[PDB]
Design a protein around this ligand. Structure first.
Ligand SMILES: O=C(NC1CC1)c1cnn2cccnc12
Ligand SMILES: O=C(NC1CC1)c1cnn2cccnc12
Lengths: 204, 204
């Protein structure tokens, strides 16, 4: 029966939406906690569920973008990882593209995270001795004072410059964890986590 | 806080249990319907969720066994697929091992499915011209009248024997779909599908 098959596919789409929100919340918490292996396994589950979803609401696209952004940040030092069809794009460059695409308020924290990802996208290339790649990442990102300081550091091959210690990788991760905390607060009330929490609490 | 972290991990285990039952029901329905691509994508989601689950109840192990059994049956003609650490084990042999391990009633249908998988495990080797592999699968499976008919067909290299048309691959799939229908009936009332169905119905 067409009608029965249709009702079941509609229910599978509702359940997939619920699973996506739950996995995003689980992924945010593993990122905030630094649970590296749980983040890897959760990322695998979220990716698979996303492939079983076709039509997306604006809320679901934002949820997917957040999962993809955290995945790229977690792989920010893995210059061998190719997240885009254009193989030249580094993981932090991919994270920056998603950050600029999310339907979200452009507050002070948004811009601080944005600039820290720009500095570290160059820094990670320098730390690996990839000086020509650093200058190419520089050209793609900036395509005045902040910009000229970076170009001077690149041309001098000053990998461990003191500038990269004031706007360090750890500083970028901490600012991102601050944003993650707000997403965790926002998604802690979604259906599947709320129902699971009520079951656990009922057994206490 | 230890207590907070613990409560969250307990809720993640509850939600993963709910997702496992839902994905098993979705996988059974794709198998019954012959929706090949939906089965592949659902299998990917179920596998990922299973890796995020540690402790399993007897009910959860049975659910996982059913997913694995259907995956092996769907790949029954893919002799290049290695489902076990011992690389000699074919997909239908792997399906037979799981079938004999599930905590389930050994009714007439159970034995009919069992014998049809045994015949087809040999038949699929013969159809690919792998006559020596067919005799090795025969030795592992039977390790009297049914047994002697099979050995004669193998030694004669009678790939398209009429015996394999009375106990055909399609006959095995139809008997398995009959069992799948009972699993679909049994899992249609699980939490996540029930909740998603109620939402869809509320919008009608
Ligand atoms: O963006 C990714 N994942 C986000 C949606 C959860 C993603 C990119 N590569 N990859 C490989 C395995 C698993 N997930 C990934
Ligand atoms: O047994 C398997 N899946 C069942 C649990 C759902 C299984 C075996 N290989 N494989 C590859 C990709 C995805 N799932 C698989």
């Amino acid at each position: 029966e067409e009608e029965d098959a249709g009702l079941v596919a509609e229910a599978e789409a509702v359940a997939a939406g619920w699973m996506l929100d739950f996995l995003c919340l689980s992924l945010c918490r593993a990122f905030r906690d630094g649970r590296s292996e749980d983040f890897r396994r959760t990322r695998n589950s979220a990716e698979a569920i996303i492939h079983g979803l076709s039509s997306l609401t604006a809320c679901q696209l934002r949820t997917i973008y957040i999962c993809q952004f955290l995945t790229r940040i977690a792989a920010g030092k893995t210059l061998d990882a190719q997240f885009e069809n254009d193989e030249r794009i580094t993981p932090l460059e991919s994270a920056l593209m998603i950050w600029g695409s999310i339907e979200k308020e452009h507050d002070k924290l948004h811009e601080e995270i944005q600039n820290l990802i720009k500095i570290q996208a160059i820094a990670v290339c320098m730390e690996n001795g990839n000086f020509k790649e650093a200058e190419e990442v520089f050209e793609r990102i900036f395509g005045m004072p902040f910009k000229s300081k970076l170009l001077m550091i690149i041309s001098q091959k000053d990998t461990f410059h003191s500038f990269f210690q004031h706007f360090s990788y750890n500083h970028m991760m901490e600012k991102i964890k601050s944003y993650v905390n707000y997403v965790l607060s926002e998604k802690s009330s979604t259906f599947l986590m709320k129902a699971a929490a009520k079951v656990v609490e009922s057994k206490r």
